[PDB]
């Protein structure tokens, strides 16, 4: 099945954060950002509160020896993993994360405290190492079905105090990095020929990605190819920048506002016209695009906590309405913190892993309203049969 055909069944999506992709250097690493161990149990407990799809942070680099070889013991214990989900029918979106910024810094910059520009040499060579990683776990993976999706970045460039205004410049640079993903995992053949893969843009921003990584850029022509950004607006609500204290957006949309605290842009019609770009950019021309990350924070307040409850909900809510009437499937960031949701400073956290249940009721009824609401955009040159 392609890119359209897996896309459909896609929505919605849900993130394994702060787990396999934590830079440690043992199998612990699992449960060092995060203190609950991956069981079947858990991920049964995602496909049960309505989530057909995983996306799985993972760092590869770090569990790397000198020589670039991938740990046999924490390939095997991704492979288990990911057969969590692809035991459920779940889709499994694997990435290569931040992964100490050995490529989504230094690939861009030759320090990671200030800005300089990278080399042909330094370019090269990190095409070589991507190419490397790549060629190891498609090669493990090979025999998974299209409900095996990977993406081989996942924030090139983010990092506002090197890269801000950086992005034209650094945008043919990743182009690159893509297509050396996309060539490697192709050469393995098997079902790694026929898998659906999945490209970041620039510093995963609709913005930059729709101006500088138009689709004439993508590493392939559109049937088994997606393109990712991420969606954090506004990251007062979002938990990104200035979102504790007074600072901070507890409600959120038209209908929502309250006292004090209340999100004074990137609302409703913000997220609409964003969303729209990506149609306008990807979708409509083929290529489905994953918001590979988004959340809102839930949060215990002390002035009115249903108008916050109820703006969680509403934003969880678009999401996963407008991304779906624009072919875009939305994944919420979920890092298995509870503690967080019983305090001002909150916690994205949907699923209590160590109970497997949700907990964050707010958000997970949000996306199921959000889902039933959306109407999926088919683009086909063939009949289906619907």
Same mark, same amino acid.
């Given at each position: 099945?392609?890119?359209?055909?897996?896309?459909?069944?896609?929505?919605?999506?849900?993130?394994?954060?702060?787990?396999?992709?934590?830079?440690?250097?043992?199998?612990?690493?699992?449960?060092?950002?995060?203190?609950?161990?991956?069981?079947?149990?858990?991920?049964?407990?995602?496909?049960?509160?309505?989530?057909?799809?995983?996306?799985?942070?993972?760092?590869?680099?770090?569990?790397?020896?000198?020589?670039?070889?991938?740990?046999?013991?924490?390939?095997?214990?991704?492979?288990?993993?990911?057969?969590?989900?692809?035991?459920?029918?779940?889709?499994?979106?694997?990435?290569?994360?931040?992964?100490?910024?050995?490529?989504?810094?230094?690939? $861009?910059?030759?320090?990671?405290?200030?800005?300089?520009?990278?080399?042909?040499?330094?370019?090269?060579?990190?095409?070589?190492?991507?190419?490397?990683?790549?060629?190891?776990? @498609?090669?493990?993976?090979?025999?998974?079905?299209?409900?095996?999706?990977?993406?081989?970045?996942?924030?090139?460039?983010?990092?506002?105090?090197? $890269?801000?205004?950086?992005?034209?410049?650094?945008?043919?640079?990743?182009?690159?990095?893509?297509?050396?993903?996309?060539?490697?995992?192709?050469?393995?053949?098997?079902?790694?020929?026929?898998?659906?893969?999945?490209?970041?843009?620039?510093?995963?921003?609709?913005?930059?990605?729709?101006?500088?990584?138009?689709?004439?850029?993508?590493?392939?022509?559109?049937?088994?190819?997606?393109?990712?950004?991420?969606?954090?607006?506004?990251?007062?609500?979002?938990?990104?920048?200035?979102?504790?204290?007074?600072?901070?957006?507890?409600?959120?949309?038209?209908?929502?506002?309250?006292?004090?605290?209340? @999100?004074?842009?990137?609302?409703? @019609?913000?997220?609409?016209?964003?969303?729209?770009?990506?149609?306008?950019?990807?979708?409509?021309?083929?290529?489905?695009?994953?918001?590979?990350?988004?959340?809102?924070?839930?949060?215990?307040?002390?002035?009115?906590?249903?108008?916050?409850?109820?703006?969680?909900?509403?934003?969880?809510?678009?999401?996963?309405?407008?991304?779906?009437?624009?072919?875009?499937?939305?994944?919420?960031?979920?890092?298995?913190?509870?503690?967080?949701?019983?305090?001002?400073?909150?916690?994205?956290?949907?699923?209590?892993?160590?109970?497997?249940?949700?907990?964050?009721?707010?958000?997970?009824?949000?996306?199921?309203?959000?889902?039933? @609401?959306?109407?999926?955009?088919?683009?086909?040159?063939?009949?289906?049969?619907?």
């Amino acid at each position: 099945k392609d890119a359209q055909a897996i896309a459909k069944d896609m929505y919605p999506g849900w993130n394994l954060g702060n787990t396999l992709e934590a830079t440690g250097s043992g199998l612990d690493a699992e449960t060092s950002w995060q203190p609950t161990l991956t069981t079947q149990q858990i991920i049964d407990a995602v496909k049960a509160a309505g989530f057909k799809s995983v996306r799985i942070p993972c760092s590869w680099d770090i569990h790397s020896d000198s020589n670039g070889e991938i740990d046999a013991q924490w390939m095997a214990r991704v492979k288990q993993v990911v057969n969590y989900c692809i035991n459920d029918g779940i889709y499994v979106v694997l990435n290569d994360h931040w992964d100490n910024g050995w490529i989504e810094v230094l690939g $861009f910059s030759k320090s990671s405290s200030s800005y300089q520009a990278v080399d042909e040499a330094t370019i090269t060579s990190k095409i070589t190492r991507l190419k490397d990683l790549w060629t190891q776990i @498609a090669n493990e993976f090979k025999d998974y079905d299209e409900h095996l999706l990977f993406a081989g970045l996942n924030e090139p460039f983010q990092e506002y105090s090197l $890269f801000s205004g950086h992005h034209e410049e650094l945008t043919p640079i990743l182009c690159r990095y893509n297509q050396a993903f996309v060539e490697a995992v192709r050469a393995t053949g098997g079902n790694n020929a026929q898998r659906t893969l999945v490209v970041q843009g620039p510093s995963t921003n609709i913005n930059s990605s729709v101006n500088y990584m138009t689709a004439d850029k993508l590493p392939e022509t559109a049937g088994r190819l997606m393109v990712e950004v991420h969606y954090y607006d506004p990251g007062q609500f979002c938990g990104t920048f200035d979102a504790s204290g007074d600072n901070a957006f507890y409600f959120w949309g038209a209908a929502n506002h309250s006292t004090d605290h209340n @999100a004074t842009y990137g609302e409703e @019609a913000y997220m609409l016209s964003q969303f729209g770009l990506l149609k306008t950019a990807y979708t409509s021309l083929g290529y489905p695009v994953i918001i590979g990350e988004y959340a809102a924070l839930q949060r215990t307040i002390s002035g009115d906590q249903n108008k916050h409850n109820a703006s969680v909900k509403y934003f969880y809510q678009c999401v996963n309405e407008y991304a779906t009437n624009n072919g875009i499937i939305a994944f919420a960031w979920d890092t298995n913190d509870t503690n967080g949701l019983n305090s001002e400073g909150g916690s994205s956290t949907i699923i209590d892993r160590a109970n497997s249940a949700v907990v964050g009721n707010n958000a997970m009824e949000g996306v199921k309203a959000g889902v039933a @609401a959306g109407k999926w955009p088919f683009l086909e040159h063939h009949h289906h049969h619907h």
